[PDB]
């Protein structure tokens, strides 16, 4: 019993973090086999943080301009190239701690773990969601660039995020092929995050977790239709609900015996009348950063190795 | 910028988790050098979950009654003994992944990371606090017994908690010398958790984190004394505040320029008037599971290796 914001165990990723220095800039890189991946803006200098030409900046570098260190060992850079917004540094030694991995691009509403790092050294792990506006509400200080986000699926690490920049309180980055999430660029412009919305299917999954854990006070006997619900949801800046979402919630409906559309009726009331000073799973707000799979994993107990 | 419930990287601990089976009972153990530590109730059977005599149960066992597996490798048990509520299983192979470690007993209000495990396999990591009533509000399903709680101090893992039982929604366990936190026993009796209170010094540390991150709406120009504050705090089930707590908050007072007693005045108002539908660091409740050190670590950026 109980319900926590739970991150994936980070051991497999900790062994891939290295420090990358170019000039006076130091940040983090990801070392898989004989390639180190890091944000390309490690080659930028003040004058260039405004309007950089990365192809120009890269052609003026050579392999020995890149100091890469895995702890105390130094890695020899034997080749470099750029793929979109990441730099791929070829090194002379393959990481012997390379896990089984793949590179995946996630969708808004999906969650992952972030291993926050400074100077190549792991500092903390936490769980977050990709927001509908393609930012994450992370926790990052200067020097955290190159920290990665990941999920663990069986024995396999799915890398889905590399941190690049902070934009007025929230955080933006790329997948591991170097393509940004959202309409952001790795330079100084007037870019801001767009309007965020609440991830409705995640709120419903969390209300199911609450029932599983004994919080039942918000239930009622009413029911509703997808279209009546989506009418009220749009008013409160909630993502609309599809039939696909209903099916995804199937397992949780089965385990609690409460139909999805029954639960939607409870959500509709919570949105119109409020919490009334009561809490749900220790929160006074409706929580939207747990997916249906997160709830199943924590309320049924899947492991990895 | 940003503020998250951040756990320690778990890699160093993942390499010490093993599976321990005795009879039909399987749970988790901690393998450091050539000793496996696990809850002693792994030797109990139904008839004994009520009123067990553990010395009797242990004398009727031999080394080959204990199946210990580190992944796929099996470990040979060459000796066993009991220290308070833990079992120490001597095995024929020293764990080569044994980190630098020590065994510490924590105080209520202190936080640590939990590596939740099933069948010896790590499943998730999360941060929690030891409550003033000596329970933790964890997330554990059947089979999680033997999962450990820890902090990382420099290069050194401080083990502080081993999970033993669930008591009506909350969780109870021992230090690694086998002594329970709180007045609990590892048998079936009528034991319940006592009344919990809110950890005041932690709430103040969190309000400082909020200011550091730009949430200032709750501040005011008033001030107060320790005794006036503690008078109102007792009314709301808050732990009283000592001069020691004030000193601990020193660094955060220095960084924000807001005196502790100034901040206490803001807390006093929040307790008497409420949140008024506004949030602090994304919460509509006063959060008490971040220590002053947690805030410094996240808002200044200490790493480990």
Residue numbers in the entry:
A (entry chain A), B (entry chain A): 1 to 167, 169 to 306
Excerpt from the paper describing this PDB structure:
A single copy of SARS-CoV-2 main protease (MPro, nsp5) is encoded within large polyproteins (pp1a and pp1ab), which encompass all nonstructural proteins (nsps) 1–10 and 1–16, respectively. MPro mediates its own release, termed autoprocessing, through stepwise cleavages at its termini, accompanied by stable dimer formation and appearance of mature-like catalytic activity. Processing of the polyproteins to mature nsps is critical for virus assembly and production of viable progeny virions. The chymotrypsin-like fold of the MPro catalytic region (residues 10–185) is connected to a helical region (domain III, residues 201–306) through a long loop (residues 186–200).
Room-temperature X-ray structure of MProD48Y/ΔP168 was obtained in the inhibitor-free form at 1.85 Å resolution. MProD48Y/ΔP168 crystals are monoclinic in space group I2 and the unit cell dimensions that are different from those of MProWT, accommodating one enzyme protomer in the asymmetric unit, with the native homodimer generated through the crystallographic two-fold axis. P168 is located at the tip of a β-hairpin loop consisting of residues 167–170, that acts as a lid of subsite S4, binding hydrophobic P4 groups of substrates and inhibitors. In MProD48Y/ΔP168, the catalytic C145 and H41 and other active site residues including the deletion site ΔP168 are well ordered as indicated by the strong electron density maps. In contrast, the electron density is weak for the S2 helix where mutation D48Y is present, with high atomic displacement parameters (B-factors) for these residues. The active site in MProD48Y/ΔP168 is more open than in MProWT caused by the movements of residues belonging to subsites S2–S5. Specifically, the helix, spanning residues 46–50, shifts by as much as 3 Å from its position in MProWT away from the catalytic site, resulting in the adjacent α-helix, which is not part of the active site, containing residues 54–60 to move in unison by about 1 Å. P168 deletion in MProD48Y/ΔP168 results in the β-hairpin loop shortening and a loss of hydrophobic interactions made by P168 with A191.
